[PDB]
Structure formats: C-alpha cells, structure tokens
Amino acid sequence: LAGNAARDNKKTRIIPRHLQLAIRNDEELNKLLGRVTIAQGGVLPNIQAVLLPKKTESHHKAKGK
Amino acid sequence: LAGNAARDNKKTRIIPRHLQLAIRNDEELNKLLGRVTIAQGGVLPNIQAVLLPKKTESHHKAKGK
Amino acid sequence: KRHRKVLRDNIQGITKPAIRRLARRGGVKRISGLIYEETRGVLKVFLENVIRDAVTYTEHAKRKTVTAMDVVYALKRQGRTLYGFGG
Amino acid sequence: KRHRKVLRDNIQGITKPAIRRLARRGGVKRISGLIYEETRGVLKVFLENVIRDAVTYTEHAKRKTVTAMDVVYALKRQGRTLYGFGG
DNA sequence: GGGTTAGGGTTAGGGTTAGGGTTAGGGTTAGGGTTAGGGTTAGGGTTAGGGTTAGGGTTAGGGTTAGGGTTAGGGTTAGGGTTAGGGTTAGGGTTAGGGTTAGGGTTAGGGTTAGGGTTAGGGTTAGGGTTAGGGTTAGGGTTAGGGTTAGGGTTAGGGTTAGGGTTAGGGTTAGGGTTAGGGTTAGGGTTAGGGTTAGGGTTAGGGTTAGGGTTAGGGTTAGGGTTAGGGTTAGGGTTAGGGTTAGGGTTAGGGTTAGGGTTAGGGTTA
DNA sequence: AACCCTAACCCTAACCCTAACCCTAACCCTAACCCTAACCCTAACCCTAACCCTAACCCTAACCCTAACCCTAACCCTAACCCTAACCCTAACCCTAACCCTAACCCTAACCCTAACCCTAACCCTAACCCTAACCCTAACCCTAACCCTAACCCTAACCCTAACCCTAACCCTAACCCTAACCCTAACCCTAACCCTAACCCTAACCCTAACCCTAACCCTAACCCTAACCCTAACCCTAACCCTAACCCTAACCCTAACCCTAACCC
Numbered sequence: 001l002a003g004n005a006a007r008d009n010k011k012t013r014i015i016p017r018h019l020q021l022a023i024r025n026d027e028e029l030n031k032l033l034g035r036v037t038i039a040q041g042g043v044l045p046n047i048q049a050v051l052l053p054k055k056t057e058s059h060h061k062a063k064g065k
Numbered sequence: 066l067a068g069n070a071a072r073d074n075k076k077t078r079i080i081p082r083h084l085q086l087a088i089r090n091d092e093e094l095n096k097l098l099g100r101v102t103i104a105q106g107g108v109l110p111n112i113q114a115v116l117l118p119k120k121t122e123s124h125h126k127a128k129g130k
Numbered sequence: 131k132r133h134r135k136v137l138r139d140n141i142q143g144i145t146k147p148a149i150r151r152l153a154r155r156g157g158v159k160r161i162s163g164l165i166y167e168e169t170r171g172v173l174k175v176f177l178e179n180v181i182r183d184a185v186t187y188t189e190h191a192k193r194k195t196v197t198a199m200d201v202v203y204a205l206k207r208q209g210r211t212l213y214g215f216g217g
Numbered sequence: 218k219r220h221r222k223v224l225r226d227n228i229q230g231i232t233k234p235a236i237r238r239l240a241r242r243g244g245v246k247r248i249s250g251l252i253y254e255e256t257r258g259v260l261k262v263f264l265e266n267v268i269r270d271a272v273t274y275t276e277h278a279k280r281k282t283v284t285a286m287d288v289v290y291a292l293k294r295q296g297r298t299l300y301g302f303g304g
Numbered sequence: 305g306g307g308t309t310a311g312g313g314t315t316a317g318g319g320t321t322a323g324g325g326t327t328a329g330g331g332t333t334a335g336g337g338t339t340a341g342g343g344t345t346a347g348g349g350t351t352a353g354g355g356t357t358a359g360g361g362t363t364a365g366g367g368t369t370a371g372g373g374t375t376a377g378g379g380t381t382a383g384g385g386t387t388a389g390g391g392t393t394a395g396g397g398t399t400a401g402g403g404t405t406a407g408g409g410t411t412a413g414g415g416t417t418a419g420g421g422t423t424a425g426g427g428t429t430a431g432g433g434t435t436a437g438g439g440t441t442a443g444g445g446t447t448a449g450g451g452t453t454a455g456g457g458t459t460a461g462g463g464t465t466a467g468g469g470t471t472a473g474g475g476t477t478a479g480g481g482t483t484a485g486g487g488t489t490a491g492g493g494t495t496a497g498g499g500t501t502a503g504g505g506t507t508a509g510g511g512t513t514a515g516g517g518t519t520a521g522g523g524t525t526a527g528g529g530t531t532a533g534g535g536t537t538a539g540g541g542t543t544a545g546g547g548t549t550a551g552g553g554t555t556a557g558g559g560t561t562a563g564g565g566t567t568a569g570g571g572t573t574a
Numbered sequence: 575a576a577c578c579c580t581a582a583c584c585c586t587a588a589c590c591c592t593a594a595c596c597c598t599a600a601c602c603c604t605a606a607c608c609c610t611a612a613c614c615c616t617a618a619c620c621c622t623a624a625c626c627c628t629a630a631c632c633c634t635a636a637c638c639c640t641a642a643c644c645c646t647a648a649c650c651c652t653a654a655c656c657c658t659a660a661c662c663c664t665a666a667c668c669c670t671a672a673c674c675c676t677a678a679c680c681c682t683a684a685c686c687c688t689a690a691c692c693c694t695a696a697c698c699c700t701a702a703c704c705c706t707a708a709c710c711c712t713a714a715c716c717c718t719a720a721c722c723c724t725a726a727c728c729c730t731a732a733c734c735c736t737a738a739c740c741c742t743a744a745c746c747c748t749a750a751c752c753c754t755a756a757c758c759c760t761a762a763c764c765c766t767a768a769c770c771c772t773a774a775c776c777c778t779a780a781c782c783c784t785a786a787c788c789c790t791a792a793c794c795c796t797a798a799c800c801c802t803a804a805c806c807c808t809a810a811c812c813c814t815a816a817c818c819c820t821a822a823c824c825c826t827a828a829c830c831c832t833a834a835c836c837c838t839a840a841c842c843c
Binding site: 131132133134135 | 218219223
Binding site: 012059 | 370371372433
C-alpha cells in the first residue's frame with residue numbers, strides 16, 4: 001500500500017506522507033490504526049461540497065435582476 | 066439530479082451535458098436508462114490507471130547510474 | 131419431526147467438480163482457484179434476480195406457488211427466451 | 218416441527234413508542250419520524266459488533282453457550298465496562 | 305376573576321430480603337535466613353543558552369463602501385389529546401430432560417543456552433541520479449448590453465367529460481376430492497475429498513525500427529440569404545362490399561389402452 | 575462396427591362422445607375517390623471562412639527474444655456425500671352454485687385548455703484582463719544511493735514444570751406444556767409547528783499606504799547527560815505454624831404492593 005501511495009505521489013523513497021496516504025486510502029488500515037498519528041505527514045483532501053466558490057451564489061442577483 | 070450536475074458544471078440553464086452528467090452519476094438512473102444516449106452531450110472522465118504518463122526515467126537507454 | 135432449516139451451506143452447494151464440468155462443457159481446459167467463488171456469486175445474484183421477478187409475478191397473480199410459466203415469462207422479460215419447458 | 222414465521226424478529230421490538238421513550242430519557246422533546254429507522258439500524262449494527270466478539274470469545278473454550286462473563290469481557294474490550302451483571 | 309377537577313402525600317399488611325450470628329474448615333494469610341540480584345554515587349566530552357550584529361521580506365495592521373444574506377411579520381398545512389375493545393401479546397408458572405460445564409488426572413511440551421562461531425546488524429565512507437526555481441505562452445475563468453428571441457402572460461371557441469338512469473355477466477366465497485409435494489429408512493457405491501511436483505506458464509528488463517503526432521500553406525468546399533413552382537399531404541359526402549351476431553347439426557378432436565419396434569448397457573474380435 | 579440380447583416407453587387401432595368448428599338464416603358502416611390548392615416538397619446560384627489536405631521532423635512503444643520462478647495442472651486411499659426404490663402421508667388445487675357488487679350505453683352541458691398573440695427579460699457573444707499547468711537553460715545541498723569493517727544477538731547438551739485425553743456428577747438452559755390481563759394496534763380528529771414570500775440593514779469585503787519584525791549568515795560559551803568501577807541497600811525462593819476468610823443456614827428489619835384522603839395547576843368572566 002505504501003508503494004501504491006508512493007507511485008501515486010511519485011518519489012524516490014517511501015516517506016511518512018506516503019504511509020499516511022496508504023493508511024487513509026486503505027479502509028481496513030484506517031479501521032485498524034484509528035488512533036495512530038503519523039508524524040511528518042499531511043492529511044488527505046477529503047472534503048464535502050458546501051464551502052465552494054460560487055456554488056452557493058455570492059451574487060444571486062445583479063441588484064434588480 | 067440535473068440541478069446537482071448543473072451546479073457541478075455551473076451554467077445558467079439545464080443542458081443535455083448536465084443531464085448526461087446526472088444520469089451517469091446516479092447509479093439508479095444509469096441502471097434504468099442503460100440503452101439511452103443523450104444527444105448534444107459528452108461523457109464522464111471515468112478512466113482506469115494504466116495509460117498514464119509515467120516514464121520514471123524510462124530506463125532501457127544508457128546507464129544513468 | 132423436521133426441526134431444521136436451510137443454512138449457509140448453499141453457496142457451496144454448487145460443488146467445485148460441478149463448476150469444473152460446466153467450464154469443460156463450455157470450452158475451458160484449466161480453471162483457476164478463485165473462479166469457483168466468483169461463479170457462485172454471479173449465479174447467486176442471477177438466481178436472486180430471477181426469484182425476485184418470479185415472486186413479484188406470483189404476488190401479482192394472487193398465488194403462492196412459482197410456476198414454470200412465470201419463470202419463462204421472467205426470463206423472457208430479462209432477455210433470455212427459453213424453450214421446451216412451457217409454451 | 219418449525220415455526221411458520223421464519224422472520225426471526227427482523228429488527229423488530231424497537232417500535233415507535235419504544236424509541237419515543239428512550240429518546241425522552243435523554244431530553245428529546247420533538248422526535249422526527251425519520252429517526253426510528255436510523256435508530257433501528259444503529260442498534261442492529263451495535264448488537265452485531267458485540268455479538269461477533271461474544272461468539273469469538275465463546276468459541277475459544279470449545280463452549281456452545283454464551284454467558285454473561287464473555288459478554289461483559291467483549292463490552293470492556295470495546296470500551297464500555299459494565300458493573301453489576303458481570304462481576 | 306371564576307369554582308375548579310386533578311394527581312400526590314399517608315397507612316396497615318404481609319413478603320420478601322438484606323444481614324446478625326455460627327461453627328467448618330482450609331485455603332490462605334502470614335512469618336525467619338540468605339545470597340545474589342538491586343540499586344547508588346562522581347567524573348569527562350558535549351549538547352544547550354543567551355546576547356547581540358547585520359539583512360532583507362513580507363505583512364497585517366488602518367480606512368472604506370456597496371451589498372446581500374439574514375431575520376424578522378405573517379399564511380397555509382400535520383400529529384398528538386382520546387377511547388375503546390379485542391385480538392393478540394407478553395408475561396408468569398410446571399415438567400423434564402438432556403446437553404453441557406466444570407471437576408478431577410498424565411506425555412508431550414516447554415525452558416535455556418554452554419558455546420563459539422557465524423551472520424545478519426549496523427557506522428563510515430564520495431558519486432550518479434536527485435528536486436524543484438524561473439519564465440514564458442496558450443489555454444481557461446469573469447462582466448456590461450443589445451438583437452433577436454425563445455419563451456412568459458392573454459383569450460375565446462369548440463372536444464371532452466363530469467351529472468344522471470338501467471341492465472349482465474363477472475367475478476366472489478364456501479365444500480369437498482385429490483393428489484402431488486413433504487417425511488422418513490436401508491445401503492452402497494459412486495461422487496466427492498486430501499497430499500505431490502515439475503514443468504510448462506507467466507512475468508519482467510533489454511535493442512530498433514517502424515509509426516504515429518504537431519505545426520506551416522493553400523484551395524477549396526461546406527456553412528449561410530432569395531426565390532418559386534410543382535408534387536405531393538389533407539379533410540369532406542357516399543355508397544356497397546366487407547364485416548358481425550343469434551340459432552342449430554356435426555365432423556373432427558381429446559382422454560385411456562395394448563404388444564411390438566426399436567432404444568440403452570455389456571462382453572464381445574477387430 | 576456391427577450385433578445381441580434385452581426389453582421399456584414409445585408404439586397402430588379403436589372408441590365413445592364433449593365440445594368447439596361450424597352450416598339451414600339476417601344487418602352495417604366503412605374501403606376508395608373525386609374538387610381543392612397548401613406548404614412542405616421539387617432544384618438553381620453566390621460566397622467566403624473556417625476547413626481539410628499534404629508533406630517534413632521526431633520520440634516512445636509493439637514485439638521478439640532474452641533468463642526465471644511459481645501454480646494448478648494428472649494417479650493415489652479413501653469414505654463421506656449421494657442415488658434408488660418403497661411406501662406414507664397430510665395440506666393448496668381445483669369443479670361449480672347462487673348471490674350480490676360491479677360493470678356497459680347514452681343525453682346533454684358546462685370545463686377549460688392549448689393554437690395564436692403580443693412583451694419582457696435573460697441570456698449568445700466581444701473585449702480586456704486575471705489566473706494557470708508545464709518540463710527544459712542553471713545548479714546545488716544534504717538528502718538523497720553505492721560499497722568497506724567490526725562486534726554481541728542468534729544460537730541446542732540434558733532437563734523440568736504443565737496442556738495433552740478422560741470419566742464423571744449435576745446443574746442449568748431450552749423444550750412446545752400453559753393461560754391471562756396489561757400492554758400493542760387503529761380510526762377519526764384538531765391545533766400548534768414547518769416552510770417559504772418581501773423588506774431593511776448592518777456586517778463585511780476587496781483593495782492601497784504604511785512601519786516595523788523576525789530566520790537566514792551564524793556570533794560566543796556554559797550546565798548538567800551517561801559511560802566509565804562499585805558499592806553496601808535491598809528482595810524472593812524451600813520452609814512451617816498458625817491464622818484470616820468464605821459457605822450453608824436461621825433470623826428478623828425496612829422496602830416492598832394496597833386502600834382512603836388533602837395541597838395544587840388550567841380551565842375564562
């Protein structure tokens with residue numbers, strides 16, 4: 001799984017960022033290591049669909065129409 | 066579902082492209098209208114993971130060690 | 131008396147030699163290991179769909195017995211016209 | 218010989234007033250109608266997760282009876298230690 | 305406002321039920337000597353500690369001014385007061401009996417490492433990739449307004465269809481045959497279930513030369529108005545020839561029933 | 575490849591007689607077709623601008639070897655799962671019977687809704703700017719990848735404390751034995767809540783000038799860290815003689831179900 005995440009991120013070695021990518025990608029690994037925090041790594045862009053530019057319509061009208 | 070796909074594509078009116086987006090996004094709609102082709106619309110970028118640019122220095126050439 | 135019912139011992143009902151004989155009758159010489167599980171799953175899904183269609187037809191016909199005519203009608207509605215059994 | 222109702226309580230017993238009485242224990246005044254099905258679902262999955270561990274614990278000593286000790290052990294392993302009934 | 309109907313504190317009467325001894329006993333708590341494991345100091349080499357000197361590099365603070373998403377004052381619309389039988393529905397016993405669960409014994413089943421000699425485990429090394437800086441350019445997202453224009457309101461005249469009376473089969477509910485799916489047992493043998501193993505069968509690097517892939521130039525040929533004139537589409541009276549329906553006669557058609565022509569195995573030489 | 579028996583379900587009459595195909599009579603509305611000219615169905619010409627059509631240049635891959643290494647391929651002893659009668663039963667199907675609930679056909683007579691028809695808005699396009707991937711010229715720093723060298727875990731000759739099977743009492747959890755009121759369902763019912771239309775307006779939202787602030791280059795120097803011996807303080811494992819702590823069984827005390835009676839909220843003038 002770490003090699004999978006590594007080729008997904010493309011680097012010469014396995015890094016804790018790739019390890020966190022693989023852990024969050026694998027549902028079984030995420031269920032097993034739930035309370036495990038990997039140092040020297042970021043999170044995954046798993047976001048909802050509300051806080052988006054436009055979408056919610058910042059204008060909605062042109063003052064009159 | 067068409068409004069969902071429209072706000073996903075952001076346009077002033079519902080277009081056949083948005084209709085095809087909604088049909089392909091909804092699994093029930095895709096199972097119901099399987100042999101239905103929406104004119105004046107494109108497909109969805111649902112692709113695998115092989116045909117990707119990824120030479121990884123290609124190798125095979127001269128010894129770059 | 132009969133104090134038992136049916137269990138998990140149903141997906142394994144389609145024995146491995148039976149699936150192998152089916153693959154040989156089709157045109158397969160060598161069958162892999164995980165082929166049997168996938169074949170059993172596909173057969174179970176198809177049987178579930180056909181049995182659901184037959185149950186819907188029987189409930190619409192106000193009956194409690196699945197008949198070969200209803201099975202043939204469901205198979206024709208799915209897209210598989212079967213002859214012989216029925217008419 | 219066998220019961221004609223083979224439903225075996227398909228997530229039953231959790232009726233509308235029953236949920237309209239457990240939610241009141243916490244302090245819920247207005248209970249929506251779309252909460253009974255979610256409550257039944259979460260209760261079913263919690264009972265399944267507990268019974269899996271209970272069966273895994275009872276199958277270790279080659280025993281075919283589930284006692285309260287294994288139940289409270291599986292509950293303490295999950296993170297909810299109960300006092301009184303176990304001991 | 306009203307009298308006001310309503311739950312909410314008292315009071316025996318057993319009925320358990322926590323608890324007040326009572327020896328029983330026997331695990332099980334409770335005591336010496338010892339030695340070899342179990343702690344207890346100080347100094348060297350070295351990771352921290354603060355107090356400035358440049359040397360940039362954003363930067364977040366302050367003013368600001370349209371503007372829109374909220375947050376208010378209503379209008380329709382759903383589920384909690386009720387009540388009540390009655391058909392379930394969920395408690396409590398009685399047997400009982402039977403599988404199970406602890407209770408005791410006996411051989412694999414575990415510690416340990418002498419021990420010395422590996423062999424994997426671990427610092428220390430300089431030579432190829434690295435990994436992302438810059439710098440375009442061409443592709444990809446925002447806004448006024450006008451030229452149609454594709455739709456949002458009118459509207460009045462006919463094709464429905466909702467209003468109402470009257471019959472006829474076509475479904476509705478029992479009431480038994482019955483018969484064809486459920487329910488077992490002997491048994492035996494045949495279909496199913498276990499190892500191997502090695503060798504084909506995949507699976508991954510290493511040339512090269514075909515074969516697609518982008519951009520510059522024309523020279524079209526494919527996108528648009530104007531007719532206009534004939535070749536079909538399309539409703540409207542009117543037959544008469546193609547149909548539909550209530551009555552017999554009746555030839556052709558649908559359940560049983562044998563005895564005879566081939567249809568499957570099994571030892572047959574080839 | 576025929577036999578060769580072996581022999582069972584297909585095998586030619588044949589025979590009612592049930593019931594649908596039918597053989598004496600009647601009405602009905604709907605297949606062509608002739609006037610009609612409408613507008614979509616008969617071809618003719620211009621143009622010009624995106625558009626195809628046609629060479630040169632080049633770089634990753636399609637495919638054919640190359641070694642190589644791992645998986646489902648076929649007997650073997652089973653022996654468990656599985657055919658083969660042979661009855662033996664107990665529940666939906668299947669026959670109409672007669673009664674109704676449930677359906678036609680028809681005569682209006684008002685409903686109302688899309689052809690037409692204007693009018694208003696809300697976009698298809700331009701025009702600037704503003705973001706926005708993407709791998710080459712450098713070049714360069716530890717953070718990246720390749721070998722030399724050395725030093726305690728990994729380690730197997732006797733041995734020693736418990737899971738391996740096994741009878742065995744007895745007890746506890748379903749069995750289908752058993753009723754019964756107090757909880758599960760149900761239909762009509764109304765009165766608060768849920769959910770949207772407009773309207774301020776105040777919060778907020780994208781900049782532009784400004785006046786410091788905090789890691790680079792490191793700039794020096796100081797407080798206990800741990801690996802050196804070791805050292806007397808400390809803490810179980812064979813003992814043994816008590817000694818502390820549950821078990822079964824009477825025992826008697828306050829919480830337990832029941833009947834009768836007084837404070838205490840919303841009713842709405």
